[PDB]
Amino acid sequence: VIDAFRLINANHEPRQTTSNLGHLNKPSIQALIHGLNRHYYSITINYRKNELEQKMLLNLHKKSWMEGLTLQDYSEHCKHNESVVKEMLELAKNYNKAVEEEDKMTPEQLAIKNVGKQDPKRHLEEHVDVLMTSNIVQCLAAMLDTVVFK
Amino acid sequence: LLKLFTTMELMRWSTLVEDYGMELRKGSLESPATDVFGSTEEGEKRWKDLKNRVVEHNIRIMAKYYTRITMKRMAQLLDLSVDESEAFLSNLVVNKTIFAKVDRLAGIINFQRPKDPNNLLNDWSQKLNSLMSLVNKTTHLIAKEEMIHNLQ
Amino acid sequence: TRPANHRQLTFEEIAKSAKITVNEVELLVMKALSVGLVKGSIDEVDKRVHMTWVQPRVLDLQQIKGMKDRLEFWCTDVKSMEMLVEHQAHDILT
Amino acid sequence: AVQKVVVHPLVLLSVVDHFNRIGKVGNQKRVVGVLLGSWQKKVLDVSNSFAVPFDEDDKDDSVWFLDHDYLENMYGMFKKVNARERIVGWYHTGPKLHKNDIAINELMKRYCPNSVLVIIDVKPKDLGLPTEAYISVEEVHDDGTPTSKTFEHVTSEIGAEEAEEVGVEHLLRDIKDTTVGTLSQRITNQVHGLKGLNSKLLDIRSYLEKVATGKLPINHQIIYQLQDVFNLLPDVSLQEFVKAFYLKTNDQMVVVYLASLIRSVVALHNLINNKIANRDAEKKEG
Amino acid sequence: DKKFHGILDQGEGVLIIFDEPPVDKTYEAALETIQNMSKVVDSLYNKAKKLT
Numbered sequence: 001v002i003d004a005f006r007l008i009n010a011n012h013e014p015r016q017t018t019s020n021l022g023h024l025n026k027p028s029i030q031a032l033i034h035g036l037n038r039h040y041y042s043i044t045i046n047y048r049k050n051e052l053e054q055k056m057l058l059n060l061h062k063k064s065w066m067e068g069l070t071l072q073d074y075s076e077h078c079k080h081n082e083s084v085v086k087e088m089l090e091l092a093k094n095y096n097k098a099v100e101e102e103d104k105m106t107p108e109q110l111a112i113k114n115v116g117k118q119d120p121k122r123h124l125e126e127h128v129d130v131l132m133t134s135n136i137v138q139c140l141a142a143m144l145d146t147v148v149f150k
Numbered sequence: 151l152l153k154l155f156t157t158m159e160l161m162r163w164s165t166l167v168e169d170y171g172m173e174l175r176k177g178s179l180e181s182p183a184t185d186v187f188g189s190t191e192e193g194e195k196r197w198k199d200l201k202n203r204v205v206e207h208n209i210r211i212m213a214k215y216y217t218r219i220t221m222k223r224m225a226q227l228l229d230l231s232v233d234e235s236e237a238f239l240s241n242l243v244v245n246k247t248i249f250a251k252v253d254r255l256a257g258i259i260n261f262q263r264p265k266d267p268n269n270l271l272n273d274w275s276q277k278l279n280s281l282m283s284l285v286n287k288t289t290h291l292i293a294k295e296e297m298i299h300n301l302q
Numbered sequence: 303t304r305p306a307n308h309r310q311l312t313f314e315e316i317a318k319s320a321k322i323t324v325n326e327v328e329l330l331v332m333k334a335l336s337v338g339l340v341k342g343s344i345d346e347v348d349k350r351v352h353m354t355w356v357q358p359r360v361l362d363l364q365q366i367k368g369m370k371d372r373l374e375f376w377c378t379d380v381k382s383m384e385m386l387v388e389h390q391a392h393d394i395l396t
Numbered sequence: 397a398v399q400k401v402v403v404h405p406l407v408l409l410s411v412v413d414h415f416n417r418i419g420k421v422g423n424q425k426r427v428v429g430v431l432l433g434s435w436q437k438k439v440l441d442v443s444n445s446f447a448v449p450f451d452e453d454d455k456d457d458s459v460w461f462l463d464h465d466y467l468e469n470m471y472g473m474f475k476k477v478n479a480r481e482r483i484v485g486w487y488h489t490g491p492k493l494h495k496n497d498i499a500i501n502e503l504m505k506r507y508c509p510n511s512v513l514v515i516i517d518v519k520p521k522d523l524g525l526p527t528e529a530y531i532s533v534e535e536v537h538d539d540g541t542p543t544s545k546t547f548e549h550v551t552s553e554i555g556a557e558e559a560e561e562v563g564v565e566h567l568l569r570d571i572k573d574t575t576v577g578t579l580s581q582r583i584t585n586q587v588h589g590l591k592g593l594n595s596k597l598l599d600i601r602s603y604l605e606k607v608a609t610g611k612l613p614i615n616h617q618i619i620y621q622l623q624d625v626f627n628l629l630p631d632v633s634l635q636e637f638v639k640a641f642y643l644k645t646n647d648q649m650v651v652v653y654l655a656s657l658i659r660s661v662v663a664l665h666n667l668i669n670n671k672i673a674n675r676d677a678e679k680k681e682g
Numbered sequence: 683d684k685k686f687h688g689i690l691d692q693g694e695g696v697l698i699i700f701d702e703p704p705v706d707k708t709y710e711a712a713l714e715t716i717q718n719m720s721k722v723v724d725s726l727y728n729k730a731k732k733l734t
Contacts (some may be wrong), residue, residue, distance in 0.1 A: 049570070050518065052415070052416060053409065054448070056409065056518070057564065057568055057570070059526045060408070060526075061585075062524065064284075064524060064525055065591070065593060066279075067585065067591025068584065068587075069282070070471055071271075071278075073275075074272055074275075075268050076646065081647070081648075081651050082707055082708035085651065085711040085715065089718065093718050095718075095719075096722045099665070099726065099729070100510040100723050120550050121662060121665075124611065124637060125662060127509075128656075128662075129524075131651055131652070133577050133581065135648045136522045137578060137654065138640040139648050142584055142645070144270075147280055147383050147588065149281065150381055150588065150629045150630060150632065157336075159332065159333055169576060212332075212420050215505060216343065216344045218344075218345050218346055218348075219342065243335055262354075264701065267640035267643045267644060268644075270636065270640040271640050281625060281628040284621060285593070286549075288622060288625065289599055289600060294546065295495065295615050295618070296603065299497070306627070307630075311565060314440045335553060358619070358624060359623075360616055360619065360623075361586055366608050366619075369604065370608060373597060373604065374601065380590055382592065384590035387586055388587055391582060391587075395587075647708070650709065650712060654712050654715060657716070657719065658715075661722060661726075668733070675733060
């Protein structure tokens with residue numbers, strides 16, 4: 001949240017118009033209340049950047065290369081998998097207990113069925129995505145290493 | 151004596167008794183003896199104790215290397231007949247001192263713990279990670295040497 | 303000298319290349335390990351010995367070439383499988 | 397010993413701005429300055445920087461000027477603005493290590509004995525971090541005999557406070573692909589790591605070529621290190637290792653199979669609900 | 683009564699000793715989840731009729 005200003009004198013229109021470049025921002029209610037376009041006027045802000053700035057701003061979030069080919073402590077892998085599956089067991093039970101409804105529930109009542117109560121479907125979707133991504137990545141790393149280093 | 155008990159290599163009781171036997175138990179006029187190994191009953195008890203400690207250090211030293219060692223060869227090297235060496239090993243294991251499985255049926259003493267596949271792959275991973283770090287370090291030394299010798 | 307794959311000696315070979323009787327071989331390797339020359343173990347049951355690593359030793363200008371060729375093989379493998387990954391995974395990561 | 401050094405995005409961007417300003421001034425190929433920060437029990441914290449006029453003779457690596465008086469004045473003014481930050485080291489934008497580095501470091505070593513050097517390349521032709529950190533230590537040889545001072549590499553990374561994170565994420569609207577899912581954990585790695593490993597191996601191979609062809613002398617610590625490297629490489633033809641690998645791959649597969657079953661059931665349920673909704677809408681419409 | 687781990691060998695008069703993880707606690711959870719979603723599919727079928 002940022003903006004650039006300048007002062008309007010006591011003279012009419014403060015500035016002249018030869019494009020739509022001024023009128024693209026829809027000034028906020030608070031700024032108007034506190035004096036915008038009455039005592040001061042805004043100016044468009046441009047964040048233009050050169051080539052080397054662009055190249056380093058892209059290079060901040062980049063980890064070392066070794067991190068790419070590091071496996072996980074396999075024991076921790078298995079513990080994580082068994083924990084999530086032991087959660088999916090109960091989530092599947094609740095999914096069953098919840099699909100049986102949705103017929104004996106008013107079309108409006110459903111929109112409130114899920115407020116303060118776990119929903120099995122969404123959690124199952126999240127856990128399935130997590131499990132499947134993690135396992136695929138670990139497997140691929142293991143195979144890729146198995147080949148690269150002798 | 152101190153170094154012998156800190157060096158990692160099998161030591162023979164016979165050599166220790168032959169060399170330091172007189173300098174410890176019977177004493178020396180130039181170097182006074184101590185009541186540690188005198189003729190009292192406690193002297194015999196502590197002499198047995200020193201025997202025990204040489205034997206246990208021998209067992210441990212072969213228990214670092216020596217994945218497998220036939221019962222007869224351990225007993226021969228420890229200077230005990232088969233039975234007493236077996237009893238000493240059994241007591242040591244029962245007391246949690248060292249880990250080993252006596253295969254009395256085949257006469258083998260295995261010093262290797264089980265290798266669950268999890269641990270095997272974990273060792274593989276540690277090896278790869280060390281490989282990666284050494285690659286990085288060798289590249290740094292290469293850059294240094296090239297800088298020192300190449301500008302000229 | 304033994305290639306990396308095998309590197310699993312036998313007592314008899316020690317006794318024949320060191321001029322010692324088989325009975326006294328074990329102490330030799332035991333000591334070698336103790337000092338810090340080689341890491342490994344012993345198999346008294348089978349009268350063999352595994353040497354997981356040997357102390358670094360200076361190499362002439364020939365073994366240097368062998369090591370370089372091994373590095374070339376390594377680089378070729380790495381590029382091959384980087385390409386495999388990228389190509390097979392193109393659509394997602396464009 | 398430093399276990400880790402963390403630089404801040406502001407420092408990187410400030411060094412880039414410095415190099416741009418001097419190059420616009422021209423007739424230079426490197427820049428030198430300071431680095432401000434604090435310590436957190438061996439976990440350094442670089443947080444800010446400023447310039448220090450410097451010039452060098454490219455032809456001979458024994459002539460150089462560095463206005464240390466400027467350094468003291470700027471340290472006074474910055475310390476007036478922010479007390480919690482004290483000099484931590486020095487930085488320069490040359491591609492790779494120069495010969496003067498030990499000389500400058502011994503000059504800098506007065507202001508902070510535990511001074512770490514951070515090189516910030518401003519033109520990355522690679523896939524890797526933009527900084528390298530180096531700490532000067534005495535090296536005693538078994539045969540190399542004379543004891544000189546050599547740089548030992550120390551782990552470095554990039555870190556940011558919430559304000560810097562906000563600003564950078566704002567500016568990073570030039571390209572953005574989050575896809576934290578499998579897409580990232582397969583572009584940020586696998587491919588990236590293989591490319592980096594290949595580049596490193598290629599550098600090792602170039603040096604080996606140069607030594608073998610006589611262009612250089614032989615270094616024995618390098619040869620021992622390479623022998624250890626080749627000795628580390630594992631063997632993948634051991635029945636025990638194959639057995640372990642298959643066992644673990646199998647477990648990973650059972651989990652992915654369960655995941656896919658779950659997903660199929662959910663998608664089918666969604667299709668059924670949509671069909672029922674369509675049928676009801678038609679019946680009500682009819 | 684599962685006091686310790688191993689089994690005898692009659693005739694030869696031997697006594698083997700080992701260590702066994704009889705269960706893995708990551709396949710049991712999977713089997714239970716398969717059963718639970720079998721029940722869920724049954725429920726969807728019972729709710730597939732309305733479509734007819």
